Amino acid sequence: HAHAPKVIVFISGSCLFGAISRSLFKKLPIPYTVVLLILGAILGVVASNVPLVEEHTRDVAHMDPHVLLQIFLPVLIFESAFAMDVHTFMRSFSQVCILALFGLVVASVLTAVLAMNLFNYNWNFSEAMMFGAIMSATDPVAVVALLKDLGASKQLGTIIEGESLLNDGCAIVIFNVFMKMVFFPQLTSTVGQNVLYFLQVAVAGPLWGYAVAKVTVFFLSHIFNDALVEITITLAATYLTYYIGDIWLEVSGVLAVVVLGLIVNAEKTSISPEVEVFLHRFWEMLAYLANTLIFMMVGVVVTQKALVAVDKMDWFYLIILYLAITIIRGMVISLFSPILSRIGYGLTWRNAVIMTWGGLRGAVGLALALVVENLAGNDVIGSKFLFHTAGIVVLTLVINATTIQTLLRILGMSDISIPKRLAMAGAVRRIHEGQNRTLNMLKSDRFLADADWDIATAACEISDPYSAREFADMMEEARLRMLKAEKISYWKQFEHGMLAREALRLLVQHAEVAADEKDQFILVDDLKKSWQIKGIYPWLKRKLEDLISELTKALIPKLILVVNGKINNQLSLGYDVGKGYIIGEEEVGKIIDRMVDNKKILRELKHISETGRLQVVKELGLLQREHPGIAVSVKTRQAIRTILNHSRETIHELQGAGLLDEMEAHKLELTVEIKMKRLMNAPSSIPPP
């Protein structure tokens, strides 16, 4: 038949409307999403009258809700899940869980009882909770995207995403639970059925996701030098996870997707060094396309069906709703602030204001409102939901995303550190004399003595981006000097092929956490790296439980082996962190004295470094003697890494010098890459000779 894929013209054409908006409106503070919404609203009026609504451009007007809930939401969730930094997230998971779960529950309940008590169109309990779960899903991408470069503590930058991802994940679960109670009546059930439902939606999801993630990460480490297989495996795995977990067996697919994304992101080492860049870009492109599509459908739908039945009463109600939701978020944050402060980091009074004002609603709420509107057929439900959600989203995008910069400048954390200013000044001045030296060298050239030097001034250089008691002074400068004077050492050794990978981050975070702290020498060894060396946890208690419990009987030895491996991993990591700390402080011990002018603090620093050394020096041997295999295993695994690194730079030196061609060097580099990848998957412990 002459039938054609009518959906191609719209979904692609909409993309173009994004491309103009992103490039043209990037300078203005206002995001392009509101422009996309206005474009969709304008297109809706034209579509209403003219016969331009063919089977295309009109199918989206009555777009099927199940497939959009089944396609858009999983990719929207998984992109943010993949973009996460899992390592820093584990350090505050405990705080984030209590900031997310209870916060979402309380916020949804309060903003539901508000609409139950305020609005005239009477709604029961279920509809109110569906409304609240729709209006309690945030999207603070811009806040972090603009706060990361400001130099603020990365803890806030990761905590914002940690709370937002969990909020979005649980909002869909609550919405789905409370949707079938009103839209799809299925008689009644006893308490046992409810218990089974709760267990299957809360426990089965993450477990299924974890199992699939483990299977795919085990199957991914066995494939060598083939990017296509990795990409195809990941793409098939995520879709299979969601589809099987949601359709064939009734489990929460989105939670399984979240767990799979987090687990895969944690194991990025097994991924090829170049595949993950392509994967990140591809997922980000999908998320951008989905956001553009969702905004345009909202824009076209709202102007025709969602506006016929409104009155000034509702337009007044909208302001009260906005005030209520921002107030509720503020009260939740303030009430939970003492508990957060008591447990670990917490937050100051400054960060709470930004947390409250930094919550921008996103496409998730709009998609849920569209689904609600599509399912319903009357005006009491499906007209208030979409109109209210669109109004709240537009208000937030207009106000908060515009005033966040002024709020930051007022709070004073937008200030640039003076050490950063002087570092930038020195760097630009030295790049200047380097450019001058290069120009001087090019000046005495037989051929290049004729080029006009006006274009040399035109190239110029990147200027400075910023432009614009007797004892308490030298000790602070000494402290901020030693912290990075020791920080540099980890990178210097690692670039030589040292400290594996995890040790670098593990010790740089320990070095920087005490930097913001006042009047305490960093790297105190008080359970900082002692925790990894000890390896104290009930893992061995679980192994003891297995032992007292003990082919089915032969399964227990397999559990014993996996427990042994998981112990040896932590033992090896402790060995690496101890070795790295010792190696770094050995250099800084001779480094410090050259800049330190005052002797009475220089000797204090030397003594405290000696104290930091000898304890960990003894502890390393204490860990070595009990389990001799781990030390020889880690030393052996490090030697091959160093040797392969040296092979790598001699190959690159020959290639750069021109003595080798391109294809032979590429083949040898591929071979050494394969050898190092084979090195990465190695037995945890090697018995001593």
Q: Which H/E stretch holds residue 620? A: helix 599-626
Task: Tell me which of ligand CPL, its own copies, none is bound by residue 193, counting a contact when its beta carbon lies within the kind-specific cut-off of 5 to 8 angstroms.
Answer: ligand CPL
> Which residues, numbered 9-28, are part of the site for its own copies (CB under 8 A)?
9, 12-13, 15-16, 18-19, 22-23
Cα 273 to Cα 648: distance, rounded to the nearest angstrom: 15
Could you tell which of ligand CPL, its own copies, none binds residue 201, using a CB distance below 5 to 8 A set by kind? ligand CPL
| 138: phi then psi, degrees, rounded to nearest 5 | -100, 180
172 near 254, Cβ under 8 Å? yes
CA angle 147–151–152, rounded 5-degree value: 65
Give the integer Cα–Cα distance in Å for 254 and 79.
Answer: 12
**Beta carbon of residue 507, minimum distance to ligand CPL (angstroms, whole number):** 34
Residues near ligand CPL (CB under 6 A): 170, 173-174, 177, 181, 185-189, 193-194, 197-198, 201-202, 250
**Cβ distance 674 to 225 under 8 Å?**
yes
Token pair for residue 68? 């959009």
Considering the complex, state which of residue 181 and residue 286 has its C-beta at the smaller distance from ligand CPL.
181
Check binding of 657 to its own copies (CB under 8 A): yes
- Could you give the CA distance from residue 385 to residue 585 in angstroms, rounded to a whole number? 61
Using alpha carbons, select from 17, 12, 69 the residue that is nearest to residue 43: 17
Q: Which does 194 bind (CB under 5 to 8 A by kind): its own copies, ligand CPL, none?
A: ligand CPL
Radius of gyration, CA atoms only, the chain: 30
Per CB under 8 A, 462 contacts its own copies: yes
What's phi and psi for 183, nearest 5 deg? -90, -30
Partner from ligand CPL, its own copies, none contacting 423, C-beta within 5 to 8 A by type: its own copies
Restricted to residues 297-356, the positions that interact with its own copies (CB under 8 A) are none
CB of 348 to its own copies, least distance (A): 23
Q: Which of 368, 415, 417, 359 is nearest to 388 (CA)?
A: 368
Which listed residue (45, 52, 54, 66) binds its own copies by CB under 8 A?
A: 66
Q: Is 373 exposed, middle or buried (0-12, 13-18, 19+ CB in 10 A)?
A: buried
Residue 639 contacts its own copies per CB under 8 A: yes
Smallest distance, ligand CPL to C-beta of residue 207, A:
12
Q: How far is the CB of 503 from its own copies (least distance, A)?
A: 14
Site for its own copies in 565-584 (CB under 8 A): 579
Nearer to ligand CPL, 198 or 218 (CB): 198
Among residue numbers 416 through 445, which ones bind its own copies (CB under 8 A)? 423-424, 426-427, 430-431, 434-435, 438-439, 442
Chosen residue from 465, 557, 565, 683 binding its own copies by CB under 8 A:
465
- Give the SS3 label for residue 361: strand
7-24 vs 275-304: helix crossing angle, rounded to 10: 100
The option from its own copies, ligand CPL, none interacting with 439 (CB < 5 to 8 A, set by class) reads: its own copies
Is 3 marked as a binding-site residue? Answer: yes
Nearest to its own copies of 347, 634 (CB atom):
634
- SS3 at position 138: strand
Instruction: Give the Cα separation of 358 and 147 in Å (integer).
Output: 11
Output the smallest distance, CB 482 to its own copies, in A: 14
Min dist. Cβ of residue 179 to its own copies (A): 14
Beta pairing partners, 361: 138
User: What residue numbers does the annotated binding site for a 1,2-diacylglycero-3-phosphate cover?
Assistant: 3
User: What residue numbers does the annotated binding site cover?
Assistant: 3
